[PDB]
Amino acid sequence: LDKQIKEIKEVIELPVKHPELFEALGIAQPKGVLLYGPPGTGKTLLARAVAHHTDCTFIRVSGSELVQKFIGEGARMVRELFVMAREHAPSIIFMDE
Amino acid sequence: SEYDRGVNTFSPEGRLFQVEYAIEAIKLGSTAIGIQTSEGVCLAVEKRITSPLMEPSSIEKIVEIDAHIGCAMSGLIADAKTLIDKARVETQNHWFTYNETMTVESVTQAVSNLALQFAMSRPFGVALLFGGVDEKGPQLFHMDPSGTFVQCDARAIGSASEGAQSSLQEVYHKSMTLKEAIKSSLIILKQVMEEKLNATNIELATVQPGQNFHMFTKEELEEVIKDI
């Protein structure tokens, strides 16, 4: 997946390790990345391996209610995740279809 | 829902509400005033101009039904066009068949007959004021989009109709001359128009027992504007 790993290294870690590289061009750092293809086709493991290589806290949420008690007492919205997510500022957001 | 206004649905109580909506829609138009006197019948409308680009001559409401009967216009003008055309042709074929001139009541009854007929699917957004002279003298008939035609000696229709009708109740009586009636009508029109009265701001017409349908007294009405 060599072209794919090339472009994902272009998209996520360059605006982590070298923000001045983007400041040298004056372009906004990307925030949202879409991965698509047939299921069981080099996704989730790629995301996890990138997060491990980049020393970023890999987080994923399925919307289950087991994990709900780990975020808030009711946590009726989803944005609440940020007040703990920003406590691990090298972090990456992922979830399934 | 939309099935409520399908074609013909009266009310939870009372008559058809869509013709009542035509009744409230008739107030979204320029006013008109009509006075029936023994000396003659006077009609007056507001041009309601919006800019000095278009010519006021094309801004036409009052038309000639025939040589002794005229009428105003109100509400939707294109709705009025069909009724005026039919009234003209029925008067003409009535003269053709009956070698005479008719009463205003016949024309008023005819347009009342067409008014209910549903061009279909809605009543016409127009209220007319037939005026003229016949064998029994001066005549002035009021017509509504519900079709209930009725005779009136003095009337105001359109927007601001009820305040003008109140002033008519204040000032109109039986033994008023034609000049007096015209002056009173212009006075009331002056106090109900939002803009200053100009030469082409309004329009006037009259019907006399002697003369035919008058040619709108154009460029003579500045005499009866400047004096007052």
Binding site: - | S11, G14, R15
Partner: protein, 218 residues
């Protein structure tokens, strides 16, 4: 065993519950409709068994519930959705009134304003016996009811009540009371003694509550 009365709500039946309360010298228990709806699970079952046990305790006694169509809603088959607490409440209600250990000591009185909501299980044949409809007050009952309610007024000897009930049709007991109370209202508005006969009719146009519309061209 088991009486149910039904009909349109303006028809009047409640008053018969108060009257039969007034007439018997026995223990009388009353229930609201959804009074047996609790989210402590089976608490309504406890309420049912407790109420009927207390009813059993007083051997001369009758049990009345108003407005059973809250609980008597027909059961149904569905997935991922559907209320089921009221199924337990209705089932224990039906069973304890009829089923095992039949008993003839209390009589169930059952009010509702509609019938097709009701589950067939409760209205089956003997779980309730007498189904009675309230007819619309046809022509003389209206005059009788307004006479009853205007009994507390100093009625002038010019009234024609059957004339009123003829000109005021399709009106039930509640609006029939509304006639006399708003007649008293308009009488106090003008300021006088008790009304005359015609003074009721300007009340009735208030009662029917017609939409205001300047429709005179008739």
């Amino acid at each position: 065993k088991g009486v149910l009365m039904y009909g349109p709500p303006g028809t009047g039946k409640t008053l018969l519950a108060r009257a039969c309360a007034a007439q018997t010298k026995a223990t009388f228990l009353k229930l609201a409709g959804p009074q047996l709806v609790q989210m402590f699970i089976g608490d309504g079952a406890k309420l049912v068994r407790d109420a009927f046990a207390l009813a059993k305790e007083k051997a001369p006694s009758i049990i009345f519930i108003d407005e059973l169509d809250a609980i008597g809603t027909k059961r149904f088959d569905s997935e991922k959705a559907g209320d089921r607490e009221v199924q337990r409440t209705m089932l224990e209600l039906l069973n304890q009134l009829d089923g095992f250990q039949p008993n003839t000591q209390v009589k169930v009185i059952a009010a509702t304003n509609r019938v097709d909501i009701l589950d067939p299980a409760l209205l089956r044949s003997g779980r309730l016996d007498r189904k009675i409809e309230f007819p619309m007050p046809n022509e003389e009952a209206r005059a009788r009811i307004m006479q009853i309610h205007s009994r507390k007024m100093n009625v002038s000897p010019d009234v024609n009540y059957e004339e009123l009930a003829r000109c005021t049709d399709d009106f039930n007991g509640a609006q029939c009371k509304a006639v006399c109370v708003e007649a008293g209202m308009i009488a106090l508005r003008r300021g006088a003694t008790e009304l005359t006969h015609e003074d009721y009719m300007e009340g009735i146009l208030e009662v029917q509550a017609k939409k205001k519309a300047n429709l005179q061209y008739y």
